[PDB]
Amino acid sequence: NKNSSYFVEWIPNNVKTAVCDIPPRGLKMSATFIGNSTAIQELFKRISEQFTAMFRRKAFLHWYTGEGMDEMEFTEAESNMNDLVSEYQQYQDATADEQGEFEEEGEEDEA
Amino acid sequence: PDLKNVKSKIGSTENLKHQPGGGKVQIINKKLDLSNVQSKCGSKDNIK
In angstroms, what separates the C-alpha of B42 from chain A's closest C-alpha?
5
Instruction: Give the Cα separation of A52 and A45 in Å (integer).
Output: 11
Amino acid A15 reads: V
E strands present in chain B: none
Give the angle subtended at the CA of B24 by the CAs of B18 and B29, to the nearest 5°.
170
Contact A38, A88 (CB under 8 A): yes
In angstroms, what separates the C-alpha of A46 from chain B's closest C-alpha?
20
Q: Please identify among residues 36-55 of chain A the ones whose CB lies closer than 8 Å to any CB of chain B.
A: 55
Those residues with Cβ within 8 angstroms of residue A95's Cβ, 6 or more apart along the chain or in another chain: A10
Preceding peptide of B28 cis, ω within 30°: yes
Q: Chain B contacts of A57, Cβ < 8 Å?
A: 42-43, 46-47
Backbone phi and psi for residue A86, each to the nearest 5 degrees, phi listed first:
-55, -35
Residues in chain A: 111
N- to C-terminal Cα separation, chain A: 46
CA distances from residue A68 to A58, A61, A62 in whole angstroms, order as listed: 16, 11, 10
Q: Does A57 touch chain B (CB under 8 A)?
A: yes
In angstroms, what separates the C-alpha of A53 from chain B's closest C-alpha?
10
- Burial readout A42-75 (b: 16 or more C-beta within 10 A, e: otherwise): eebbeebeeeeeebeebeeeeeeeeeeeeeeebe
Contact A41, A92 (CB under 8 A): yes
Q: Chain A contacts of B47, Cβ < 8 Å?
A: 56-57
Q: Chain A contacts of B42, Cβ < 8 Å?
A: 57-58
Q: Chain B contacts of A55, Cβ < 8 Å?
A: 46
Instruction: Give the Cα separation of A9 and A18 in Å (integer).
Output: 22
In angstroms, how far apart are the furthest CA atoms of chain A? 78
Rounded CA Rg of chain A: 24
Instruction: Give the Cα separation of A60 and B25 in Å (integer).
Output: 54
- Resolution of this structure in Å: 4.1
Instruction: Give the Cα separation of A61 and A71 in Å (integer).
Output: 8
Q: Which residue of B has its CA nearest to A75?
A: B46
